[PDB]
Symmetry: C2
Subunit: 207 residues, 2 copies
């Protein structure tokens, strides 16, 4: 309960430092700046997107969920993507995963987690789509790291499959989609080099 | 359909920024990332809006690592949304979080978009939850004459209803019975001033109010 007071005191100190360090920060923040990026990341990742990316917050529209998923029938993430593309006219969409991801780890443990099961089932489906690759990695840690990367790649594919991204990219040549991995050990972003154009053509084949 | 070269240049700009940022943090503390990647479980679940302009841990002056975060359009907790319900269940049953905060903000594009008559296609069902909050409080909101004050009141009521939806979850009710945590708070962030306001939700009263029907 003392926790409440602690946060409000920190907020006041942060406002004072921000006013002293940056004169027009609140004025700029209260002024409208349209974000250039949609970032989809994990709820249990440890550093905010704009810090990692060295952007000012206001430049990144953010969605975070367990294990940075983009499931087909999830209106929560689909409404984020639709708003970002059709309302904000964002030029970049990023899916960013991270190593030491509790969401991805939890997905592999054979427990019935009731309500969590259908969410984490999406990660187990990534595992089955890439079973030969993953089963050929003998070290548990390296296998887990590869699963986090494949999960990002499949989340990226799911973004590219949205009608919002396909229609916008056809009519206007944006946005592009990237998959990244954030490594807490070094703080460095690594690009997974999802081939957007190749993936977009691969997906448009049907029709 | 070829990717314009200017979209490729933006990529390299971000990776440079990230390298510079890593250099800075290694200056301050050679073992910053070594420490960061050993840190313990977060004590707070923060539910906020996607179009809010400052991250939770900054607003709250916490180290990131201390806040498990969900952000969505208009900081909603809809009954049948497995995305947010799985965040709440994981936070309570896996992370044993002590606090859940729903934080709204004034100048919320999500809440604004909910009141504009446009057909948003796929967005209409998501923003329908905000329209439901307006219907639940129609006489209050229709009696506020200034458009800006009405919109601000809608943002506050939206946070309060998101909080009610958290307190309805079996995870929160069972944990609170067994261990007297987590507690749920509704906050508003005011970008004009940088200040948090507590909406003072009355967790225990709301928890009783909800348990009545059963
Ligand atoms: Zn994670
Ligand atoms: Zn908002």
């Amino acid at each position: 309960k003392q926790s409440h007071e602690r946060i409000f005191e920190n907020n006041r100190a942060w406002v004072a430092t921000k006013m002293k360090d940056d004169p027009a920060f609140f004025e700029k923040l209260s002024a409208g700046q349209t974000p250039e990026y949609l970032y989809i990341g994990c709820s249990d990742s440890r550093v905010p997107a704009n810090e990692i990316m060295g952007l000012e917050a206001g430049e990144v529209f953010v969605h975070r969920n367990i294990a940075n998923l983009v499931p087909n029938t999830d209106l929560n993430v689909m409404s984020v993507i639709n708003y970002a593309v059709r309302h904000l006219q964002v030029k970049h969409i990023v899916v960013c995963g991270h190593y030491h991801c509790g969401g991805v780890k939890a997905a592999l443990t054979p427990s019935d987690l009731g309500l969590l099961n259908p969410w984490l089932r999406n990660v187990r489906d990534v595992y089955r789509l890439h079973e030969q690759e993953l089963d050929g990695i003998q070290d548990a840690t390296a296998r887990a790291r590869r699963l986090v990367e494949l999960n990002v790649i499949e989340s990226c594919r799911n973004v590219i499959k949205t009608a919002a991204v396909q229609q916008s990219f056809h009519e206007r040549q944006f946005p592009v989609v990237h998959g990244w991995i954030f490594d807490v050990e070094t703080g460095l972003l690594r690009d997974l080099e999802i081939d957007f154009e190749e993936t977009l053509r691969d997906i448009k084949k049907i029709y």
